[PDB]
Each structure stands twice: as C-alpha cells, then as structure tokens.
Design a protein around this ligand. Structure first.
Ligand SMILES: *[C@@H]1O[C@H](CO)[C@@H](O[C@@H]2O[C@H](CO)[C@@H](O)[C@H](O)[C@H]2NC(C)=O)[C@H](O)[C@H]1NC(C)=O
Ligand SMILES: *[C@@H]1O[C@H](CO)[C@@H](O[C@@H]2O[C@H](CO)[C@@H](O)[C@H](O)[C@H]2NC(C)=O)[C@H](O)[C@H]1NC(C)=O
Ligand SMILES: *[C@@H]1O[C@H](CO)[C@@H](O[C@@H]2O[C@H](CO)[C@@H](O)[C@H](O)[C@H]2NC(C)=O)[C@H](O)[C@H]1NC(C)=O
Ligand SMILES: *[C@@H]1O[C@H](CO)[C@@H](O[C@@H]2O[C@H](CO)[C@@H](O)[C@H](O)[C@H]2NC(C)=O)[C@H](O)[C@H]1NC(C)=O
Ligand SMILES: *[C@@H]1O[C@H](CO)[C@@H](O[C@@H]2O[C@H](CO)[C@@H](O)[C@H](O)[C@H]2NC(C)=O)[C@H](O)[C@H]1NC(C)=O
Ligand SMILES: *[C@@H]1O[C@H](CO)[C@@H](O[C@@H]2O[C@H](CO)[C@@H](O)[C@H](O)[C@H]2NC(C)=O)[C@H](O)[C@H]1NC(C)=O
Ligand SMILES: *[C@@H]1O[C@H](CO)[C@@H](O)[C@H](O)[C@H]1NC(C)=O
Ligand SMILES: *[C@@H]1O[C@H](CO)[C@@H](O)[C@H](O)[C@H]1NC(C)=O
Ligand SMILES: *[C@@H]1O[C@H](CO)[C@@H](O)[C@H](O)[C@H]1NC(C)=O
Ligand SMILES: *[C@@H]1O[C@H](CO)[C@@H](O)[C@H](O)[C@H]1NC(C)=O
Lengths: 366, 236, 49
C-alpha cells in the first residue's frame, strides 16, 4: 500500500494495490493418431539397385516420414547431410522428396558431393553446388559383389561434357575421343562409354560395391505434406493448464461438457469470438474450457497513525483458492469475494469503510 | 477406345430460378442459437441458373452443380485447362464400389463417356501425382459445390429426397463439407461424365460470386435460415 | 591452404551475447552416448578453413 501510494503514511480507507491470478500447473498437447507413413522400408531394404548411370528415382509426397529411426540406424556406414542438421529435420518439412539410389565403388563414395569431380561425378551423377538434402552410403560386398564377377553393374566412362544437376545419362552412343568418325563400331578413337563393374567378394575396401541413396528436399509453392509425426501426450482435467489442441493454443481449465458437436466441427466459440469447446483428436469427445480464476486485491486499513494491522479482500474470488495470508486469521466468504483478517459480528452499526453487497468493516481489531 | 457419336448431343440450354438453394457451412466452428454474418463466395438468392437436358463449360471462381437424379446415371467429372497431357488434369469417378480421384496428364477424347460392359475415355495416363479412393458419393436431388482456393480443392455435398416434378423445390438445406484436397492446379474448365451405353439427362449449373450472408444457428448448430444482404432494401 | 583457423560446428544450444566458448569436446549428435570416444554420430566440433 505504501509503495502504491508513494508515501510513508496511509489514511483510513480501502485501496486497490495489485492483481491476482492462478498459475498454470503443467502443459499438454494432443494430435491425431498419425497414420499413412511414408514408404521407406522398400527403398532401403530393396533386393537390387540399378546402375549408377541409371540411378533409380523415387518421388515421395503426401505421407508422414520418421527419419529419426534412419538417423539412429547402426547399419549405415555413412549418413551425411548438407542442407540442415540431421537431428532437427524431423520437425521442419518441405513439399516433396526425391530419392536417387545407385551402387558405386568404395573409393567413389565421396565423388557424390557438391563441388566435387570424378568419373561418376561428371559422367554418371552430378550434384549441384547448392544441393540440399542427405546422402546415405553403406557397403554391400556380401550381397552386391559376385564371386563370378558382378559385371551387371555398369558405369559411364566417356562423355563430351559433364552432367547437369539431377540429370541422368543413359546414352549408349559410341564415344569418339578423336577426330576419326566410326560407323557404330569402336575403333582406335571410338570406345564404349559404359563399362561393366568388376566387383568381387575379395577385392579390398575401396573397390567393394557400395549402395548409396541421396535424398533431396524440394519446397514448391504447393503445401508441404511430408514430415515427421508430432508426438502427443496424455490429458488432465480440473486444473488450470495450457494446451495445444491440434495447433489451437490457450490457457484454461478443462472439464467434461454435454454440448453436441455436429460430426464435422472441431471446436466451438460462443460469441465475441472466444473458444469455449474443443474436440480431442484421439478420443473424439467434447471438452469445455474455462479461464482459471483471477481478480484484484484490496487492503482495508484503519490508518497508519491509528494502528498498524490491515485486512485483505480478494475481489470476486471463491474462498477455496487463496494462495503469508494463506491461513492467518479467520477467513470470511462474502458476496463480494473473500476476506482475511477480520472477524464476523452479529451486530450492526454505521458504515465506516464500505466493502460491498451490504457489508462493511471498521476498527475496534478489525 | 473412345469415338465420337453420330448424332449431336444438342442438350437444350434452358434457364430457371435459383430460389434459396446453395448454402454451405463456411468453416468447422460450432455455434448455438446465434446470428453470424460472413462474407464469402455464394450463389446469389433468386439467381438465374442454367438447365441442361456435354459441352465444355467454364469454371470461374466456383461451381454449383445440381442433379435431379433417378437411378444414378451421372458418374464423374473432369477438370483442367488445356485438357491434354501437356498440363495437369483432374479426374473424379464414382463407380459401384468406391470413388476414384486422379491427378495426371491424360489424353482425353473429343467426347468422353464411361461405357458399360474400367476407365477408357483417356488414351494415355502419364506422370501421375495424386491418387485417392474413398466411399461412394451417391427421385433424389444431389447438390455439390466445387471451389479451388490457394491450391486447395474444396468439395461440399448434399443429398435430398424430393417428390416435385421438374424445378428446384422451395426450401432450405445447408451443405456439409465433404472433401479437401491439397493439390495446386489452375482449373478453368470442366466436364460431365455419363455412363452412356450404346443404345438425354437433366442437370443444373450455377456460378458463385463474393457477397455477405447472415446465417442463423439453432441450439444444435444447424443452419436453418439465411439472409442475402444485397437482394433488396429490407434484406439490407 | 591455411588451417590455423577453426570454427565451431556443433553446440548444444544458442550462444548468449558476448559469450566465449573454447572447450573442445566430442559431440553426442545421436542417441548413442560417445562416452568421450569418437564414433557414429560423434564428431569434433572444430572445423578448419
Ligand atoms: C530393413 O529390414 C530390417 C529387418 O527387419 C529392419 O531391421 C529391424 O528394425 C527394427 C526396428 O528398430 C528392429 O526392431 C529389428 O530388430 C531390426 N531387425 C534386424 C534384423 O535388423 C530395418 O529397420 C529395415 N529397414 C528399413 C529402412 O525399413
Ligand atoms: C486412436 O488410437 C487409439 C489406440 O488404439 C484408439 O483407442 C482405442 O480405441 C478402441 C476402439 O473402440 C477402443 O476399443 C480401445 O479401448 C481404445 N484404447 C484406448 C483408449 O486406450 C482410438 O480409438 C483411436 N482414435 C481414432 C481412430 O480416432
Ligand atoms: C466455492 O466452491 C465450493 C466448491 O464447489 C462451493 O461449494 C459448493 O456449495 C454448494 C452449495 O452449498 C454445494 O451444493 C456444493 O456441493 C459445494 N461444492 C462442493 C464441491 O462440495 C461454494 O459454494 C463456492 N462458493 C460460493 C460463494 O459459491
Ligand atoms: C470400382 O472401382 C474400384 C476402384 O478402381 C475398383 O476397385 C479396384 O479395382 C482394381 C482393378 O481390378 C484393383 O486393382 C483394386 O485392387 C481394386 N481396389 C479395391 C479397393 O477394391 C472396383 O473393382 C470397381 N468396381 C466395379 C464394379 O466397377
Ligand atoms: C511431370 O511431373 C514432374 C513432377 O511433378 C513435373 O516437374 C515439375 O515441373 C514444374 C513446372 O515448372 C516445376 O515447377 C517443378 O519444380 C517440377 N518438379 C516437381 C513438381 O517436383 C513435370 O513438369 C511434369 N511434366 C509435364 C509435362 O507436366
Ligand atoms: C436438437 O437437439 C435436441 C436434443 O438432442 C433434439 O431434441 C430431441 O429430438 C428427438 C427427435 O427430434 C427426440 O426424440 C428427443 O426426445 C428430443 N430431446 C428431448 C430432450 O426432448 C432436437 O430435435 C434437435 N433439433 C432441433 C431442431 O431442436
Ligand atoms: C496522529 O499523529 C499525531 C502525531 O503525528 C498524534 O499526536 C495523534 O495522536 C495521532 N492521531 C491519532 C492517533 O488519532
Ligand atoms: C452470532 O455469531 C456467531 C458467530 O460469531 C454465529 O455462529 C451465530 O449464528 C450468530 N447468531 C446468533 C448466535 O444468534
Ligand atoms: C434468365 O436468363 C434468360 C436469358 O439468358 C432470360 O430469358 C430469363 O428471363 C432469365 N430469368 C430470370 C432473370 O429470372
Ligand atoms: C495457372 O496459370 C497461371 C497463368 O495463366 C499461373 O499464374 C498460375 O500459377 C498457374 N497455376 C498454378 C497452380 O501454377
């Protein structure tokens, strides 16, 4: 009171000092059951991968993809990422994903990178210097390499120019290194641009077959529909908490409600555009939201010059949630709120310090 | 397997009155016993709606489609701008078991028709992006509203049992939302699909315009009455 | 090429204004604890130029 009045003495009366509100206890968040997972098992558990110059391309859109398990997979030799951090990509998401799968040599694993050159990097698959996404590489010597020679795999060795970003070259034209033309038959200056891979089970690290899949993320103006599930939690009732019901955020106390939502609404507002009811996305039931209690506090004093003790009134607050004056003295509940520090008397006198609803207080104690 | 027919399908393009049909729930918010004013695309009251007894038609901002259907002869819809494989096209079919939605660059024929003895009205189907299958859509009145806003296709539907003979009956019936699709296309024309067996159908088409309406919600949240704020001075 | 200059690559949180960090410790990028030993999802936070 003295601080609010900015004085060291207080006259008799009732003053309004500060406010009061209940604080949130914990937080909750709800989301639908989460289904329609992006097809990724058939990509990384596929039987065979195509050639490096004929890399398989897969388009991913309109699903939910959990990349945390891929990042936590212990069977992957190399898991690199360029555009974003591998840990936090599960939250942010773009509109579509492109997967390029192929098989290269052990020493050619670092050819597939921005700002890199090589036979694969310039003839089979070239990444733009501004590429965003990730690359997953793993040895497959026990599977792809053949004891009789895995010559089914083929790699491009010759081309007049390099490869454009995300461009596939499958041209089988006879490369003419020299100026002597050839009528489709390789000669001194004519050669086949594609050569079979000579993978063997016993060839050493660096020449063993390595399966590599490159994931690229694109953010066309169409709405983004592919990224990780949003983990939900349980719910509580009869507690002023803050909630995030399917992206609708607010603070209040949640109770059971008897309103009858029609089967396509999700939340309701009464008037002046204030939400009152929500539907939990999992259990599909109607809840009720109430703002948890608040109100002003006032001090009743007989005057600093007279005495030194005071009483406190919380305005429009039920006498159940009061919290140093948590117990104090006898506590009275009145139509105007709750009062602490004064005793109720059966007599009746002239009104000294008005309080409200037909009652007031005076000093004798208060 | 698509060929043009011999006779022309000279469907008479008649006109009739809209009355007070074509009201749909604008959002998914529940309100009880309240009057709410909203501005959006609607079919104006007492408008002048076209009646067909399969020409290429424009799309404009939105489309209101009505069918005085008997025994479920209408089957689907086609959406697009160039209607060829050089641009994206949308296809919706409702056969006996389910409804199929495709977003591909097809090569339709000059007079598509379903045929009965699946889909053969298109010569090619390439670069397919979106596929969808769901429950079937359909003396009955079938009302549909088609909208396309910021890459979202909105489809609202309603079915009504009627006993009147020819024109749209007087009354009020709101339309619930049915389907939302997050596909970005700039559709400007559309078409009707009929299962024409080799051996003459009436439907109504109207357009939507931006305006403000006043809607009444009863205790249960059902829209039971509406007022058009631009019809006449009393309504204003 | 000059390699006497290095910059931080990994950090648990965001630096406060006018703050200095010089500690060189392995990063537990993944769920698997590195336990002070480099391995999968464990990288040196300093990157040269
Ligand atoms: C490819 O298949 C293997 C075999 O099932 C998958 O590995 C399993 O992953 C689950 C998920 O953590 C584990 O509980 C199993 O113990 C694993 N089994 C084996 C034999 O490894 C692997 O996850 C699949 N890969 C993809 C991308 O789906
Ligand atoms: C979301 O998934 C949960 C987990 O299965 C579903 O909860 C079960 O629903 C069945 C359906 O009758 C009940 O028999 C079970 O008792 C529920 N288990 C619980 C509540 O722990 C829930 O129904 C799903 N919600 C959907 C599909 O909307
Ligand atoms: C403050 O809250 C309590 C808790 O509900 C109220 O006590 C209720 O009083 C009514 C009428 O006497 C009873 O029918 C209820 O059973 C009581 N509730 C409980 C949980 O027992 C109290 O009335 C509230 N204060 C005021 C001024 O209304
Ligand atoms: C109605 O259309 C649906 C959708 O195309 C048909 O169901 C599919 O038919 C294809 C072609 O035989 C199958 O490959 C799919 O497996 C079917 N899917 C389902 C969910 O059944 C259906 O057969 C058609 N029915 C009629 C009577 O035309
Ligand atoms: C075939 O489909 C691809 C992929 O949907 C189309 O490639 C897109 O083309 C548009 C046109 O400028 C670009 O803005 C996109 O970035 C491309 N990639 C996407 C959407 O992933 C291609 O245009 C289609 N071909 C035809 C003839 O329509
Ligand atoms: C709005 O909802 C109420 C309550 O659900 C409906 O009242 C019930 O209507 C059914 C059939 O119309 C009766 O069998 C019930 O007995 C009614 N409830 C009670 C408590 O009597 C009401 O019909 C709904 N529609 C309107 C326009 O009010
Ligand atoms: C008010 O204060 C003065 C001294 O400042 C004192 O003499 C007087 O008695 C006080 N009045 C009371 C206590 O009623
Ligand atoms: C008098 O006051 C007491 C408590 O102060 C109360 O319990 C009682 O009901 C009142 N009236 C009487 C005793 O008639
Ligand atoms: C509808 O338009 C036609 C011509 O397009 C006209 O003959 C008819 O009177 C109109 N009906 C109205 C305005 O109710
Ligand atoms: C449709 O074409 C217009 C140009 O006429 C273009 O501005 C618009 O972006 C196109 N729609 C989409 C979804 O790209």
């Amino acid at each position: 009171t003295k601080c609010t009045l900015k004085s060291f003495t207080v006259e008799k009366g009732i003053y309004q000092t500060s406010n009061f509100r209940v604080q949130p206890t914990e937080s909750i968040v709800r989301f639908p059951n989460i289904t329609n997972l992006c097809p990724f098992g058939e990509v990384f558990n596929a039987t065979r991968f195509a050639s490096v110059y004929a890399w398989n391309r897969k388009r991913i859109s309109n699903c939910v993809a959990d990349y945390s398990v891929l990042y936590n997979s212990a069977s992957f030799s190399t898991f690199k990422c360029y555009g974003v951090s591998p840990t936090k990509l599960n939250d942010l998401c773009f509109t579509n994903v492109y997967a390029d799968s192929f098989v290269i040599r052990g020493d050619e694993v670092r050819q597939i990178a921005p700002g890199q050159t090589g036979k694969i990097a310039d003839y089979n698959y070239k990444l733009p210097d501004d590429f965003t996404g990730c690359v997953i590489a793993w040895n497959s010597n026990n599977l792809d390499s053949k004891v009789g020679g895995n010559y089914n795999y083929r790699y491009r060795l010759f081309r007049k120019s390099n490869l454009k970003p995300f461009e596939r070259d499958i041209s089988t034209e006879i490369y003419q290194a020299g100026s002597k033309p050839c009528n489709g038959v390789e000669g001194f200056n004519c050669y086949f641009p594609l050569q079979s891979y000579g993978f063997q089970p016993t060839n050493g690290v660096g020449y063993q077959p390595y399966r590599v899949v490159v994931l690229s993320f694109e953010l066309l103006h169409a709405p983004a529909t592919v990224c990780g599930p949003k983990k939900s939690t349980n719910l509580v009732k009869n507690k002023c908490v803050n909630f995030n019901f399917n992206g609708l955020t607010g603070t209040g106390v949640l109770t059971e409600s008897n309103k009858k939502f029609l089967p396509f609404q999700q939340f309701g507002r009464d008037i002046a555009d204030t939400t009152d009811a929500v539907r939990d996305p999992q259990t599909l039931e109607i809840l009720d939201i109430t703002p948890c209690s608040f109100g002003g506090v006032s001090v009743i004093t007989p005057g600093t010059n007279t005495s030194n003790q005071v009483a406190v009134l919380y305005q429009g607050v039920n006498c159940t949630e009061v919290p140093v004056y948590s117990t104090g003295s006898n506590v009275f509940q009145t139509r105007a709120g709750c009062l602490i520090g004064a005793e109720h008397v059966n007599n009746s006198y002239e009104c000294d310090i008005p309080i409200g609803a037909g009652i007031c207080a005076s000093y004798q104690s208060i | 397997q698509c060929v043009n027919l011999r006779t022309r399908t000279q469907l008479p393009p008649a006109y009739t009155n809209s009355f007070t049909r074509g009201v749909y729930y604008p959002d998914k918010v529940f309100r009880s016993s309240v009057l709410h004013s909203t501005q959006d695309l609607f079919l104006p009251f007492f408008s002048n709606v076209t009646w067909f007894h399969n020409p290429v038609l424009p799309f404009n901002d939105g489309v209101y489609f009505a069918s005085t259907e008997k025994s479920n002869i209408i089957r689907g819809w086609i959406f697009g701008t160039t209607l060829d494989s050089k641009t994206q096209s949308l296809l919706i079919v409702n056969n006996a078991t389910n409804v199929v939605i495709k977003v591909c660059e097809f090569q339709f024929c000059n007079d598509p028709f379903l045929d009965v003895y699946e889909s053969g009205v298109y010569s090619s189907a390439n670069n397919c992006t979106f596929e969808y299958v769901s429950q079937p859509f359909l003396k009955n009145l079938r009302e549909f509203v088609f909208k396309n806003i910021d890459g979202y296709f909105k489809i609202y539907s309603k079915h009504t049992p009627i006993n009147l003979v020819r024109d749209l009956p007087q009354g009020f019936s709101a339309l619930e939302p049915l389907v939302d699709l997050p596909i970005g296309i700039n559709i400007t024309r559309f078409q009707t699909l009929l299962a024409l067996h080799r051996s003459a159908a009436a439907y109504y088409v109207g357009y939507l315009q931006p305006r403000t309406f006043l809607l009444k919600y009863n205790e249960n949240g059902t829209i039971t009455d509406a007022v058009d704020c631009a019809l006449d001075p009393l309504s204003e």
